[PDB]
């Protein structure tokens, strides 16, 4: 386990934890999912959270979030949701996520990232070196 993998999980947690209180609620999960073209019901949001909510408190904290990711890395069923996430980042549908597309999507998600931070994200996910993130590279970024 490296500092960087922790920092990537932390970056992902803060994207869902909109108010920074340390827990992800159904409302925060719901607003992030709608920003990615989804429309989950109140019942689906509660069921999604209950699957990963180890205690009964109804919200996801940082350890639960990490356990959620470790289970999903062992269970290779969630390809569909990664494909659906790819569709939102790849705005023009050409098979590549450009830095401009990532910048636009992160700004939509209420994220104040510098242009260098956006570039860093593209470069870290980029495997072939073309300066863009194709589907295969997006999968590897999501699943490690
Ligand atoms: Cl060991 C390990 C470490 C990290 C990951 C993933 C990840 C993906 C989704 C979730 Cl819910 C949690 C973690 N990961 C890689 C990078 N980022 C930060 C990343 O941001 C970097 C990024 C790079 C390239 C591209 Cl094209 C998009 C993004 Cl968002 C990001 C990805 C997905 C979401 Cl929903 C939120 C975030 Cl902040 C997280 C997986 C395994
Ligand atoms: Cl943007 C996004 C975020 C997560 C996923 C997948 C996933 C699956 C395997 C691996 Cl190794 C990495 C990621 N995943 C992980 C967890 N959930 C369940 C649920 O996913 C909801 C979801 C579905 C589709 C899309 Cl496009 C986005 C989301 Cl957030 C969820 C996500 C985040 C939190 Cl904080 C809590 C939950 Cl319960 C899905 C796909 C797209
Ligand atoms: Ca919160
Ligand atoms: Ca909890
Ligand atoms: Ca594109
Ligand atoms: Ca590439």
> CA 127, CA 109: separation in Å to the nearest integer?
25
To which residue do tokens 């920003």 refer? 35
> CA 89, CA 81: separation in Å to the nearest integer?
13
Torsion, CA 74, CA 88, CA 6, CA 75, rounded to 10? 0
Which of 119, 142, 143, 144 for mutating ligand 1's site (highest number of atoms within 8 Å of CB)?
Answer: 142
User: Relative to the CA of 125, which ligand 1 atom is closest?
Assistant: 24
Q: Answer whether 5 contacts ligand 1 (Cβ < 6 A).
A: yes
Strand, helix or coil for residue 37: coil
Task: Report the first-to-last Cα separation within the chain, whole angstroms.
Answer: 12
User: Relative to the CA of 144, which ligand 2 atom is closest?
Assistant: 11
27-33 long-range contacts, Cβ below 8 Å, gap at least 24? 29/60, 32/109
Neighbours of 86 (CB within 10 A): 19
Residue 134 bridge partners (DSSP) = 96
For ligand 1, the distance from its centroid to the CA atom of residue 55, given in whole angstroms, is 25
In angstroms, what is the resolution? 2.3
Alpha-carbon separation of residue 12 from 17, 34, 66, 138 (angstroms): 9, 16, 10, 15
Which of 35, 81, 89, 121 for mutating ligand 2's site (highest number of atoms within 8 Å of CB)?
Answer: 81
Residues 102/86, Cβ–Cβ less than 8 Å: no
What are the backbone dihedrals phi and psi of residue 61, each rounded to the nearest 5 degrees, phi first? -100, 175
Which DSSP state fits 36? Answer: T
Q: Which of 98, 119, 96, 115 is nearest to 107 (CA)?
A: 115
Which DSSP state fits 35? Answer: H
> CA 138, CA 62: separation in Å to the nearest integer?
23
């Amino acid at each position: 386990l490296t500092e960087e993998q922790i920092a990537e999980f932390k970056e992902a947690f803060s994207l869902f934890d909109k108010d920074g209180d340390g827990t992800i609620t159904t409302k925060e999960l719901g607003t992030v999912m709608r920003s990615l073209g989804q429309n989950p019901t109140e019942a689906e949001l509660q069921d999604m959270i209950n699957e990963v909510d180890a205690d009964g408190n109804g919200t996801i904290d940082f350890p639960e979030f990490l356990t959620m990711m470790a289970r999903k890395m062992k269970d290779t069923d969630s390809e569909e949701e990664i494909r659906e996430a790819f569709r939102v980042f790849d705005k023009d549908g050409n098979g590549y996520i450009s830095a401009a597309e990532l910048r636009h999507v992160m700004t939509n998600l209420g994220e104040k990232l510098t242009d260098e931070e956006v570039d860093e994200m593209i470069r870290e996910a980029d495997i072939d070196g073309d300066g863009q993130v194709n589907y295969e590279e997006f999968v590897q970024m999501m699943t490690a």
